[PDB]
Design a protein around this nucleic acid. Sequence first.
RNA 1: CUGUGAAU
Lengths: 15, 394
Amino acid sequence: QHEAPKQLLQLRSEI
Amino acid sequence: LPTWSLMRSRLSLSEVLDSGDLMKFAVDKTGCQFLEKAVKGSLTSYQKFQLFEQVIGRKDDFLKLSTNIFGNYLVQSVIGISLATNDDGYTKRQEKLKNFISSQMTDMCLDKFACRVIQSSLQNMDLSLACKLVQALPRDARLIAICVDQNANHVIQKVVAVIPLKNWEFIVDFVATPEHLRQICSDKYGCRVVQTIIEKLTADSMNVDLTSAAQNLRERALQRLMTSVTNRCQELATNEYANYIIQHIVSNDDLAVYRECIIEKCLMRNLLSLSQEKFASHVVEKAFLHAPLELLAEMMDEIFDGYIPHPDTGKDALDIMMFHQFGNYVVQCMLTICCDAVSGRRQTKEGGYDHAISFQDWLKKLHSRVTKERHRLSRFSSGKKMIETLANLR
RNA sequence: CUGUGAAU
């Protein structure tokens, strides 16, 4: 698990 | 080895059978080697009678030989000879053999050598009596240990391969139990059991021989297991072993109906996060490759416009995935799919629509981004592959 | 800048 940290982004809202 | 047979000689099989010393020959590296070749010759009716009595006729000796590194080979030979000897003791011998194994089913399954006697019996005995072997399997937590055992897991896979589903339908519902499914699917060996069960429950080319009544039984069991799998595909898709099961469902054409369910239940709205996972990125790859076109459009829209760019840098989801050590394989998949479409290697019709105009749209997006980032991309093997994929199109 | 699964 010698990986780079995840880069998360805000999700667009769903309808 | 007894001294009357000494190292080796010109021994006769009847000598061994008449001596009472078969057991110390069958557990010996050189003795069992002599017996394996002796039982392959033309045996008299009495010599077969002696082998049946001494190898598969005494429970304790049968258990000892079946669990022996060498003797287990002799047991399988004698079982085969017994099944090939259609005499008046045929019914009595097969019944005795089934009772012997059934009385020690669990421990024989967990034994490195005795589990081979089980598998050999399951595929060679008459179908009726082999089915009774399945009834001896445990129904408690020992079934979990059997599915995740390095040896006993092949017994279950053998049952699935050679026994009608009616006899092992309880294993499907046992594995489908949510608690059991978590332990088994997250195991190196239990995940093979689950995938083998799914493959046998699939209405593919290997099951066209089933009757209609058997297809309905197969379909109902498949729906109960798929319900359990899709109820938890998020933890399965990210698991180091269970990700292979989610991949198989998403990529199998004869399981196409369960593609929309899996893709919508745990993949949609998580593509950026799962594409950066060592194991789940493979599932995401398979999802892009086999998604229905209307759902594929939603996956494309999520990558291209489903996320708000980072407020400080302006980095978007495509930027993160394109240069990620795992996400780059997903972006490559997206590009290969689009290039296959515009060039004709992939058909674009579905549901009355021709999605060719949509593939051209997504390819335009990826071509536009690869062009802007051509210098950063040229540092990487994945980037040079994306540039080369686009150049091959023109 | 390459990335994961069976016991004689």
